[PDB]
Chain A
Amino acid sequence: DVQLQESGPGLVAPSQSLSITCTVSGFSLTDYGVNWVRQSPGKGLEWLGVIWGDGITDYNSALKSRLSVTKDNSKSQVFLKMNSLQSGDSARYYCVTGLFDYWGQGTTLTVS
């Protein structure tokens, strides 16, 4: 009994932003951290970033300059924010964790 659900735009343009939202139930963002991970066709499962129980965050170095992970504990939502998006950014984005113990459906994202 613990759900994770991504909510994104699906479609976006070549230089625009990206805002995916994770609604979580079954627990409290105050005690567990949440991760963001994307997987594009032709495999390649890459970790994007994380935000722990304490508002501290960690990001993928070769992406650092574009993302950010935020969250509202009282509303149980982790947010994700990228920008300067391009083709490479098309993939499936997931917000997971209990240390990768639980995952969410994911959200597709095609740029252009």
Chain B
Amino acid sequence: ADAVVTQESALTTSPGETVTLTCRSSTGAVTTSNYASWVQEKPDHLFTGLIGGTNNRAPGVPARFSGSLIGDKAALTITGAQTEDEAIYFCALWYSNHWVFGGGTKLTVL
């Protein structure tokens, strides 16, 4: 482990649409033992925990957000996007002894 976690650079959507963000591991499929976590960064360097442990939604987070594994990757799905969801999203994947963040995905909601 000294792996690289990859995310889609940018993604465009619309209020009412459905968008899916994914997180790749350079060492192979993403297990539930990678504890995939997702956090959102709103303007003003503001961070919010969304999902942790593959699919556990932090208390107080909207129901439009949900995480899961889909293939060799971890996925965060916003069902019925909304304007205020425009932000940069990050995934963290737990390896053997350390956490490793992804590059982040810029989500634009037009």
Task: Give CA–CA (A106, B47) in the complex, Å.
Answer: 10
Q: Which A residues are CB-close (under 8 A) to B101?
A: 37, 45-47
Smallest CB–CB gap between B87 and chain A, Å?
13
What is the size, in residues, of chain B's interface with A at 8 Å between Cβ atoms? 22
Using a CB-CB cutoff of 8 Å, which residues 1-39 of chain B contact chain A?
2, 35, 37, 39
A50-68 CB contact bits vs B (8 Å, 1 = yes)?
1000000010110000000
Binding site for B on A (CB under 8 A): 35, 37, 39, 43, 45-47, 50, 58, 60-61, 92, 94, 96, 98-103, 106
Binding site for A on B (CB under 8 A): 2, 35, 37, 39, 45, 47-49, 52-53, 56, 58-59, 90, 92, 97-101, 103-104
User: In the complex the two chains form, is A100's CB within 8 Å of B98's CB?
Assistant: no
Given pairs A100-B92, A101-B49, 4 additional interface contacts (CB within 8 A): A39-B45, A45-B104, A92-B45, A98-B49
